[PDB]
Amino acid sequence: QPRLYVWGTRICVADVQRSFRDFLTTFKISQLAEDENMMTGHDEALHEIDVNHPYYMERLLECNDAEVTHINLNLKHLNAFSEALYRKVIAYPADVIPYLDIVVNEVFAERFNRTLAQSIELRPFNATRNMRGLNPNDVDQLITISGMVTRTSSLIPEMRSGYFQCAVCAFGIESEVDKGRIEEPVVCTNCSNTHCFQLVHNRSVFLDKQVVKLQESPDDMPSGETP
Amino acid sequence: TYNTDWAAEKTKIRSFFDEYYVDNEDGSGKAFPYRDQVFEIARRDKQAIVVNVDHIKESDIPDALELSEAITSNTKRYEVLFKDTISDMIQDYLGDKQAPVIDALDAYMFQRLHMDRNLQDKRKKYPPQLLQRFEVYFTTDDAAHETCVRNIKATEIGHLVSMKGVVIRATEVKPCVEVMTYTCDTCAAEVYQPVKGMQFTPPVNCPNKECVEAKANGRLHMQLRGSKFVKFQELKIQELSEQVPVGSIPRTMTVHVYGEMTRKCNTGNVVHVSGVFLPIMLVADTYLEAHYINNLDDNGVQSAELEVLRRKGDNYETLAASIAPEIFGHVDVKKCLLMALVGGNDNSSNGMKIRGCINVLMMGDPGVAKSQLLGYVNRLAPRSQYTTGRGSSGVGLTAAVMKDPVTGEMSLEGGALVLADGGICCIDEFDKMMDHDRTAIHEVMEQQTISIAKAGIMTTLNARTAIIAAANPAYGRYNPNRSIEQNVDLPAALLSRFDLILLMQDKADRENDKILAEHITYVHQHGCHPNREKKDLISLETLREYISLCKTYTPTVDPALRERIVEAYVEMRRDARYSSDPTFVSPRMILGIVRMATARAKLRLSTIVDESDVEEALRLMQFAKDSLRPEQ
DNA sequence: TTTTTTTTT
């Protein structure tokens, strides 16, 4: 039976998903000490979270009722549940995040028998370091830092899928952009001419991107350093 | 006329590592420290070896001189041979065991070598930068290799060179590519590309023979789990003042730093550097590739001369006498400088911070050795800056906005009080500074910050510095007919920020003049102080060591001292009301008392403040007060 | 081009 592995690491995808499904359906420990920005939800106006239930199962009710599309995942709760999964999340965020999402969407669909306009998305938080203490070992790992916002840019459109049209017979094809790259068609399957297509930019699909500039806090620093 | 038999050279190098030794200090045996460091690399407690070429030169081994000369003359090649011999030594130590996996590249290599399993194949498939994962650096101490920035010319390309200088500019650490790894789409093969220099060009088409013959047109995609990165940093280093020719300005040079030698320097440090001089890939640009760096600001170990003092105790009088022994007298002034070199404790009760360090202002008549004392303090302190009143702007003291003409960007540039952070700033000719330049230090002397809001910049900088200042009275001499406020022409807001204010007179007297003349003429005869009483005095190096030891303590105040301190403050504040020639007194005074008491407890190396230290602080403040009314 | 800053006359 063919099986999928993360390249060079021997992590298999599905065995993580089993444990994360258990975490979502079962964790209820920390709810005596719920935090200030996390203790309210809503169907309309505002409502208060109940202690006694599995916590993320309770938080999914907001996604059903108020149609919120994201979950804030406190990583301290996951570390309390299982360090063996917490280490994988921090070490490989670019590989495991596309599947813990799917576990959340599966549990939502099973619980409520319902679909939504966009997928429910994860946001892990509360993993702390300094901007100078980063090393080449930390590339593609999960980190958290703090500072003050000085400037924000205007929005940039970032394409996800282009749209080609044949110049000779007005046939049209979609083409996904992935790994930063698009693939251009060469032969028109309708009229059988070659090197024939032209990209139509405004028939294609884009996403939002923004740049934000962040500044060091001056408090922690050693002698003589500027922020 | 060239030698390329690498196996014989490897044999010589391995014989050096096997046979260098140092005798044990108890005489129990011999240490073989280089192979101990090799075994530390083998068990992965280490990342680099620093080799001293002079040890190779003075080893008791055949062809040792020839090996040292070959290393020095073609250092860029001999690094590879040293890495190869250390790799062979590591495998001989390790045997059939495996080194531990610690990072993702180690995990990838250990997994992939046994995927390949499931020496010719290993060496053909993998480049040696990827197979070997440690660093090798060289050093020299002999004066044959000492040069300036100015002297490094065309004869020095490819050679090992050593020098000494000051750091102007330094970048932050960045990831630098060493080996790229690519994988093919269709045929799942891998390409390894080592990178040399500051550029590389990625290959496009797959080279594997089956893919090429099938014409499968598989693209190559780069992967950063298999690729190798290394810490990189860039510096600019300037000539030291003694190295410059007569009537000339110092020159500068660019330095590239890799790996474990990064983050050893910041701006405002003096360094000793060993490295290799190279071009950039018919007229060429050049740089220096650093091999070893040493801070001369910095350099559980204790010297025997310090051990004698630490066993002796009662060191306060000797420590006071040891500050600038060429200068006769001024024992209490030297004690005040000794307290300013140490300082008190920082306090942060309930969010409110209080400054811990001590500020001293010296004044006096001309020719009474103020500049000599400031120069000795600047040599004695670890991190310190020296400025004059005329040569400095209020932007050169604090921080500046710099407009880069190449890019158009704005940036900040830290001044003297920023560079001296954690240390001492000496300000000479303090009375001749302009008022609008002088008023910049008001925030630094009490809040220890600099805050800026200009152009497109808004920040705060830390400036945790003590200030020692020297001046003349208001018309060049003390006038006994005018008041204290007329003699000391400073505003009260600035005057309250100094913990101690002193006056040093010069008055003619037929015995003291002869005694001073005897002392100065002896110094001019012999080049050293008289020491007619044959008492002990402390060297500058071990005095620096002792002050560095004193800074580690944080003695706590006894709550029994409360009534003595508070009653002293009230009694001090009575006189400023009921005097004919008063001075300004404010609530900062009692904090000054607490600072000086904790400073003398630090000098004693005790952990609890004594009433003796409180009394000595009161005695010094009384002396400082009495200095400002001579012959009254 | 116009704008903002720090040394010099």
Ligand SMILES: Nc1ncnc2c1ncn2[C@@H]1O[C@H](COP(=O)(O)OP(=O)(O)NP(=O)(O)O)[C@@H](O)[C@H]1O
């Ligand atoms: N007590 C002393 N012992 C030894 N040398 C002394 C003494 N008093 C003055 N000198 C010498 O006097 C010279 C001038 O020293 P200097 O430090 O410039 O005095 P000053 O206090 O700075 N005068 P000024 O800067 O004009 O206010 C130096 O060569 C000193 O060695």
Ligand SMILES: [Mg+2]
């Ligand atoms: Mg002077």
Ligand SMILES: [Zn+2]
């Ligand atoms: Zn067509």
Ligand SMILES: [Zn+2]
């Ligand atoms: Zn291929």
